[model samples]
Target: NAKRIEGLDSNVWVEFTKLAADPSVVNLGQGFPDISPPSYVKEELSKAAFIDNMNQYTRGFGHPALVKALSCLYGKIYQRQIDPNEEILVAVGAYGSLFNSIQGLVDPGDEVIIMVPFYDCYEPMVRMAGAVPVFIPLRSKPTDGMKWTSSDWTFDPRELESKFSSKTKAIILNTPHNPLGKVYTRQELQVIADLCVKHDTLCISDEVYEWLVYTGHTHVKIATLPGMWERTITIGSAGKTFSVTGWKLGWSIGPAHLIKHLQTVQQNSFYTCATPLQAALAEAFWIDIKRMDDPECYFNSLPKELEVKRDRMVRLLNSVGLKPIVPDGGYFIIADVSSLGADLSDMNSDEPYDYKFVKWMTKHKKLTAIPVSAFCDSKSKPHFEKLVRFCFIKKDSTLDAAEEIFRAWN
Candidate 1:
């Protein structure tokens, strides 16, 4: 109803998801998994629901047990003891934590550098905070191998550094990034770390897919870099971690000074997250912490199956001449559709190529995907129009259906 929400009404999900809503259409657009979230998460939630006290609001910043589990788990990974109460603030979702970061820190006229083909929320959130969003896109570092992986995507050091300046308040970083599935290496984090330190800008590190790395690729936390711990507010989601998007739980881990601001945002906004969900997530985390070394654990087990699914989807696309950028981590597979040279002359000419192509695939081919341009800035939109993203974190039956769809088209 206000000016902030004016132009922000534009969303890509409304178009494609509605089209993919057809009973016959096979959807690969949204990022959530079609497979179940795992038996333990459900059992834990059931326990929390039955517990009388667990239904009410527990903590304003975070439920005590939930923050303790998050602090312990992340503290182990970062090799530092984390204060559960001071360093973490559980939110409505990673999205809530994300909004908190922007709403709490950014001032009017400040710049928030966001990598192109981003998750699509960063720009609008930054704008809502009355800040200008500086865009730095990742471009393909060309290769000679028969297969090109998402790791092939890299940011030019100079271009990235140039985006940082006096007005740069923060840079939003999403590793094992959505849409493109580009996992940042340790060396990659340092390049960004150095720039943030030089400019004295804060880092909003969003690591929702923190545990979904593939066989050889690792999910490196930017906050682990030297001098980064003090300035970075790293966010994680129960939704992404446990494959339970319905839970809508997430948290931020950072220095007390920085996290305090996020906590203030929590006090004014939703005030607190769902007590039952937090309680269940806390138990879920405790169990996973104990089983961290075991291969059967959900964190340990889900990635392996997702990798197998990724490989199959890559091959399926490759066989039909749609060369997919094989994801090194995360679940999406983006492919260039230019080579296919499909006769899209029939669709509306003014819209983006990928938009027309994706709609064409859904209506005629019975399979749907997200247009890659929807994730890019206006200047870069046309350049990315030849690409589209397909999520691979689906059930085997879903993948088989997609494979059949491709085979029939072939």
Candidate 2:
């Protein structure tokens, strides 16, 4: 009953990350910031660690402080008052919340539409929950010149409207999206909202990178759209917010009725999250949340830094005959590797050209990237064969090293 789902497979990042870990190779594969979390948040954690009576276990839902802080902080962002006790489920991480929610909500053979070149985990999460993932790829509009905007990944409203049926149960929305980094506009989300309401569908809105938008783009909470509040499960992360991947603390906000089901699954799987981390997170939220918009705040500066790094990678890739599609948000950009006709003609090869090229680049050029084809369904492989994903979230020194390698390789 628990066999691996047919379409689910090992993620592209895992393969490339291994090559990246080699001492000799310069990594651009993993989509994590190589820097430490903001100083204020880390200080809060330190204070929590030393606080009397802070080591005890928190409630199954969350530490009271964390729940309250999250409610207020996220409330301001979503522009709505949130009730902490009923509307929130503090998950161990965004990934954990996603898995638990899918398992709880999706029944056997139900179809969950996933937009293609999605985060690598969504397919397996849907399948493991016994739902068939119906992928609707964001059609790349014809564009002139090399620098592609986030607008290039617009979905056809007609095609999206057609994907919802009686069997459709849910859809996952990752704004400030990973891999592609396309923040769905208000207009696009309204189309999604209309469909969800029409079909009575649940929405798992993943806004983990909500704070990372650029180029005058604002991160719109899909739940804020009319008719979507009750049906939408808003997922967020303290890790992404504070730049601490190791924290492993995240939460979901939604209507009580839906989150109750998520709580059941969470209780059965992982009953309580780390008490100390929750305490720290709670403190961070209360004390440091106000600083998020400040120039001194790492959260504000991070996107600016990433923007610079993104441009660096873009120019370097361009010099090497690789064309990169620039992202309006998040820490990544996808490059088209079709220019390098390096002969990836092995029919027996399970890997796409981008995958093979990345591996070869790591070994010889000493560089690493993830293949975009890994984010697609099997049927999507042919069309997505030439794209490789690169993370520009590294330190300036690391970026310099990558640029040097690209210069020599080109």
Candidate 3:
């Protein structure tokens, strides 16, 4: 085995999660919300458990009722009727959908372009498929006076274009990106779409946070761009959709022709997803589709509620001088911790400063966060070594607890 095999040795989540496992620490570290998912969806899940024949396997690619709901909803959004039977596949989670796309389409030695800082799993998953991961870190291009928002995180167009070659099989695109929470602007996506079209490459677009965008920003699907629909496989998550991370349900939508590859992966592996979760999420989708305009609708209501929490934490972090990078959408707000000048030399010197800082903060300040460097590929790790990510979809009391900690330090 090569060094790529050795790359699988360390898992960022397993190590950091174990460190944050202590019950006394205020863990705003991970992405899952500390708040409860909506009441109605849970009731539907309970109802599905008792319904006649609901326990059996659904259609291997996707459930019929669920696909129909997604087709109708997405059809309205994309302004075209999608063939639900052939174009959709429900898998274990967004993780499963992503795995299918890579394993189904990638060949050994093929190169896949991934951006950094990224979700830590992307690198290992690409390696598992026997492909090389080519990384591009989006550097800052901030406006003169405004605070950091998703718009400021941008990549050099020429560099992105140069990454595409005959060996380049595809690029993974995430909107409302994890850790950074940078929603790719339409202009940026157009640049990517143009290169993919010219290079004849595939696009594995992850839009699990499609609806989590805050005010002043809107999520655009690259598949909607010219020539992209036929080449892009867009992934979505039910867990991220309704804040039910435990649901472990997700989907992929694309043209029937390209979806065949993903279909092959799911059929051979998990075969099919849990039928009860599929039925329950479909039921919830149907209800939301009917009253999409209603203020109380969960899609509109949840983000409406979360935006306030995002702002609350942003204000608190700014007051405490942590220099938070405010996100336009998604649940995370990563901040620069360099200002404190606190020494953490007692920690393992091998670890990055951000890593040591978070551990020390968890142990002493009783507050914990994810080191932003953990999301970076090695080349970009040093760039983000002074930052820590904070997830804000947590309950108000949790934010209050964090505020108390910061105030005490002041």
Candidate 4:
């Protein structure tokens, strides 16, 4: 009876988030920002809250105004016109969109390629859909004893290609990737795009952290690449884009053929997202499109603010004996905690080393972080057991508390 639920039991966030809920915990385990969104977003949401029609159901696929605004914004970014009614699908969040995309397209017994150290949800979603998940890890080499950058992580083309075959259905691609915060370069994307095109594989590109990329780093959408628009379903999250994780607004954009399948999955399941939230998101996108180039724009400025927080976190972690892998994008920093050399004699020997370390740190030090091994496949967990992930998208005081903890420990 429980056979279908094989891979869904062990979730990293479910376990760690509970530990982080203690009043004394400095919660850096989850990826949500502790600070409020910009005033403009709140203002729009307030206005939407009072709209008469927004209280009722919207169009099953998407609120018309929201889809139109998204079309206009994405059109400018993609340099191509988007059909709001036919090509854009609004779901509960990017996670919902990903679920719809995977379930709609992947068939039973088909092989779906997943990059290791992935977002924890992807593996279970594939298994639930009855698709076989083929795991390919991003490999990194020693950076000549220098501090590691996200760019240091690379995948073997041969290994990636070998995973694709007659049974291959799709590959889930996450840019500004989680845990490691690696933003895939255009060249790197081109390699994957070529393989997908060659094997006629569908690309499920999760670009939720698109706007969180750092200076000198870029988030390349696989759908924008040659021969990809027809086969790629690009997912975006208003929550991630707007610093409002609770809003839960997200969309899937692609050619009509690919989007139609997602619509099928969405219609049968959660028919429509909350109407009031969509209305507010519509206003946010409308304003952002007009101010895309302005330095004051949240899109242009959020990353700048986050860069400072990231550097501060890195410095503090380093001073306290954790070696951080400096990310090129996103809010998370993965640090090597093996240097602490903490004794694990009392912890469960069967658990991943990073898991034990995180639990100990959270309970004893009043500081919390996620184990990077929780993001890896079972067989590969040992390789990443020395690292832990900390979310830096937090208030100054929240980070200051963590810094104080580090100082006390030192």
The alpha-carbon deviation from the true structure for residue 86 of candidate 1, after best TM-score superposition, in angstroms, is 0.9
- Runs in model 2 deviating more than 4 A are 1-18, 144-146, 341-350
In each prediction, how many residue pairs overlap at the backbone (N, C-alpha, C within less than 3 A)? 0, 0, 0, 0
TM-score of each: 0.98, 0.94, 0.97, 0.97
Question: Which ranges of candidate 1 are over 4 A from the true structure?
Answer: none
Top-down TM-score ranking? 1, 4, 3, 2
5-124 per-residue lDDT for model 2 (tens digits): 654565554555456568887877776788767677778778888876677777888888899999988888778888898889889789988987898889989999999878878988
CA-lDDT, candidates in order: 0.89, 0.83, 0.88, 0.90
Q: How displaced is residue 132 in candidate 2, in Å?
A: 1.3
Which of the numbered candidates is closest to the native, going by highest TM-score? 1
Cα-based RMSD of the predictions, in order? 1.1, 2.1, 1.6, 1.4
User: Residues 75-99, candidate 4, lDDT per residue (tens digit)?
Assistant: 9889999999999999989999999
What lDDT score is found at residue 227 in candidate 4?
Answer: 98
lDDT of 2 at 87: 86
Encode model 3's per-residue lDDT on 279-356: one tens digit a residue: 999999998999998998888998899999988988988887898888888898889899985767776567789888
